[PDB]
């Protein structure tokens, strides 16, 4: 289907159906629309490094893609990868202009190592996103701290 | 929406860009004002009537449709989603020939 859009009334949350339109839903300004990025650790995912690395993997034939998210959650655990292959060459791409590290991290797990980079880019096995500064990417960037999460789109109440 | 995640953090300590009070003097000038890591404002939303745990699940279910939307597009960085959602919102209501008495039309005679 199309991208689900959550609608908030008071403290209740509903999912806007395309076929059924609710006139009670009011949108007076684009400033009511808000895109939120929520971390995976909030779902009870293991934050330890070996469990995390197992959630990531390399692949080729898949271009990298990026979205913008306007607001995010403070992360207890973030990650920063700097890894190569036996020949000493980097297997992770440099963060292109505009992509910075996740703005809020308590503990940042700096990771180094070497291995068989079996792909051009490193994606998320579970389909989640690597959240950066107001940008969620499908790929890990070199040397830039990140937190892994997912994005939701909202239409806030009458403010 | 009903959270199906094994655990759910009810407390949402969040950060964002949009501010409240623009009058901090000249701090709006890029030469002055916050560095890259100071532009943010923080807040705390509580799990009122399972709102947060609802959002958490919503973010999970949205992932599929979102990931496919990105596959379709060829642009590297997509910022146009929210404006697109705003347009679809209007088209839904006014696409459109509007019958007052009938449904799919938000008008009242009073």
């Amino acid at each position, epitope marked *: 289907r199309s991208i689900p859009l959550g609608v908030i009334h*008071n*403290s209740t949350l509903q999912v806007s159906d395309v076929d059924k339109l609710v006139c009670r839903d009011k949108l007076s300004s684009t400033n009511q629309l808000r895109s939120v990025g929520l971390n995976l650790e909030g779902n009870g995912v293991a934050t330890d490094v070996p469990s995390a690395t197992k959630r990531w993997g390399f692949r080729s034939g898949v271009p990298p893609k990026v979205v913008n998210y306007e607001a995010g959650e403070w992360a207890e655990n973030c990650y920063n990868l700097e890894i190569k292959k036996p020949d000493g060459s980097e297997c992770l791409p440099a963060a292109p202009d505009g992509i910075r590290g996740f703005p809020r991290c308590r503990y940042v797990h700096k990771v180094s190592g070497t291995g068989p980079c079996a792909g051009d880019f490193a994606f998320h096995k579970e389909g989640a996103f690597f959240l950066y500064d107001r940008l969620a990417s499908t790929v890990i960037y070199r040397g830039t701290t990140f937190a892994e999460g997912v994005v939701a789109f909202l239409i806030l109440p009458q403010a | 929406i009903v959270n199906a995640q094994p655990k*759910c953090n009810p407390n949402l300590h969040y950060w964002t860009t949009q501010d409240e009070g623009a009058a901090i003097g000249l701090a709006w000038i890029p030469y002055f004002g916050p560095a890259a890591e100071g532009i943010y404002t923080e807040g705390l939303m*509580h799990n009122q*009537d*399972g709102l*947060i*745990c609802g959002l958490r699940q919503l973010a999970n279910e949205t992932t599929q449709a979102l990931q496919l939307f990105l596959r379709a597009t060829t642009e590297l960085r997509t910022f146009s989603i929210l404006n697109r959602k705003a347009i679809d919102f209007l088209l839904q209501r006014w696409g459109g020939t509007c019958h007052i008495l009938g449904p799919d039309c938000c008008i009242e005679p009073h």
Partner: antibody
Amino acid sequence: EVQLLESGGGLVKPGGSLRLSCAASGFTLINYRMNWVRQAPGKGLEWVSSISSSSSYIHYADSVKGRFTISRDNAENSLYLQMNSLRAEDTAVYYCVREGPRATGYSMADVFDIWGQGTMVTVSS
Amino acid sequence: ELVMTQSPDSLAVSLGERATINCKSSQSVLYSSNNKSYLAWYQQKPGQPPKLLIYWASTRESGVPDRFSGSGSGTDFTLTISSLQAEDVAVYYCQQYYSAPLTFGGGTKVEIKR
């Protein structure tokens, strides 16, 4: 760290009234939906009442409807239940209970992950 | 109003051997959207309030030892204790939180054979 301290209860005559109190520590009541659960002497558990964070969505057991009125104070981090027109069948141990964070008055419920120490309520002439 | 039924009412097993407790609901507690069975298990020792053991029928709560494990879906469910030991002597209740009013089973008393 996380716990619930209960007050009130005791002896009361049939038709009398009592007010159970429950004070939370280690978390904020705003995040969770609170419940009351009773347990008659030597018998099983019976759900009594529930109240959402916003205090918007409230529910009682049919056997209790109209006689009990549940309430909460998020700022004071407390939960209260006022019981009126008490009778013998209400004689039981009343537990202050926290429901999971996934519970909402307008959707599916959640489990009772934290239980209070309990308080004895005896209805007798 | 769902009626939860536990069996057996009482059970006595030798230390180190396994014990199983059944639970039967009047109606299916399976949520179509989640494919999650909304059922919970509690432990209540004498003079103490209940303690959460299992939620969503199969998922152990944090801190519950591995020997506790639940299973089943829809109508029939089971709580299983492998290697009973001493600290597991209690009354075990099953509960549905699929639809209101939330209801408990009659409870099962687990004792040790000596």
